[PDB]
C-alpha cells in the first residue's frame, strides 16, 4: 500500500519566474541528464522520431518547441515509471536526479497546453493507495488519467489489489494527440495540483475534488 498525502518530498517545480532562463539552460541540462541516464536518452531518441511524425498534423501554442513535444511523447512512453519514481523520491537523495531538463520541459509542455478547462478523469492502479489524512492531496509526480472510467478500470491499469481515483482536475491536459495510444483518452495532471477535498469509498475508491493551484516547495531549483 502507498501513502496518499501532500507529497512533501516530491520535486514539484512549477518554474515561476524562470521559464526564459530555463528554455536557455535546459538544452545543456538535457545533455547532462543523458550523460548519466542511458534509459532516458534512448527513451527520448525514440520519442523524438515519433514527435517528428506527429508535429505536422497540428499547430501548437506559441513557444511550444520540439523539446516540449518530445518530452510529452516520451512520458506516454516507458520512461514514465522511472521518471515518476525519481520525482517522488527527490528530497531523499536529490543528488541523483537526472531528469532536470526533462522535468522542466514536460512541466512547461503541460502549462503551455493548459487552459482553464476542468475535466472529470479516472485513474486505475494495481497498488492500493491509503490516504493518510493530511487535509489535502497532491500526486507529487506527474499523473496520467483518462476521460473514460472504463479505460481506468480495464485490466491494463486497475485490479482488486489497486485503487480507482475519481478526479476533478483543472490543470490536467488532454494529451491524446501525443500518446502512443491515443484511445486511452489520457489527461496528464501535474503533480503540483492540490485537491482540497479527499474522500475514500470502500477499499478501492478515492474521490479527489476541489482542485486548486498552490505554490510548490521547489521553484526554479536549477535555474
Ligand atoms: N492509469 C490510468 O488510468 C491511465 C494510464 N495511462 C498510461 O499508462 C502508462 C502507465 O501509467 P501508470 O500506470 O500511471 O504508471 P505510473 O508511472 O503512474 O506508475 C508509477 C508506479 O510507481 C509506483 N507509485 C506510483 N505512485 C507512487 C507513490 N505515490 N508512492 C509510491 N509508489 C508509487 C506504483 O507502482 C505505480 O504504478 C502511461 O503511459 C500512462 O500515461 C493512460 C491513461 C490512463
Curated annotation (Swiss-Prot):
The modification ADP-ribosylarginine is found at residue 181. Keywords: ADP-ribosylation, Cell membrane, Disulfide bond, Glycoprotein, Glycosyltransferase, GPI-anchor, Hydrolase, Lipoprotein, Membrane, NAD, NADP, Nucleotidyltransferase, Signal, Transferase. A lipid is attached at residue 223 (GPI-anchor amidated serine). GO terms for cellular component: plasma membrane; side of membrane. It catalyses: L-arginyl-[protein] + NAD(+) = N(omega)-(ADP-D-ribosyl)-L-arginyl-[protein] + nicotinamide + H(+); NAD(+) + H2O = ADP-D-ribose + nicotinamide + H(+). NAD(+) binds at residues 75, 123, 141, 179. Its EC number is 2.4.2.31, 3.2.2.5. The keyword Glycosyltransferase applies. Disulfide bonds join 18-220, 118-170. It is found in: Cell membrane. Residues 38-215 form the TR mART core domain. The active site is at 123, 144, 186. It comes from the Eukaryota. The keyword Hydrolase applies. GO terms for biological process: NAD catabolic process. It is a lipid-anchor; GPI-anchor. Postthymic T-cells. GO terms for molecular function: hydrolase activity, acting on glycosyl bonds; NAD+ nucleosidase activity; NAD+ poly-ADP-ribosyltransferase activity; NAD+-protein-arginine ADP-ribosyltransferase activity; nucleotidyltransferase activity. Has both NAD(+) glycohydrolase and ADP-ribosyltransferase activity (to a lesser extent). Belongs to the Arg-specific ADP-ribosyltransferase family. This is T-cell ecto-ADP-ribosyltransferase 2. It comes from Rattus norvegicus. The gene is Art2b. The chain holds residues 24 to 246 of 275 of the full protein.
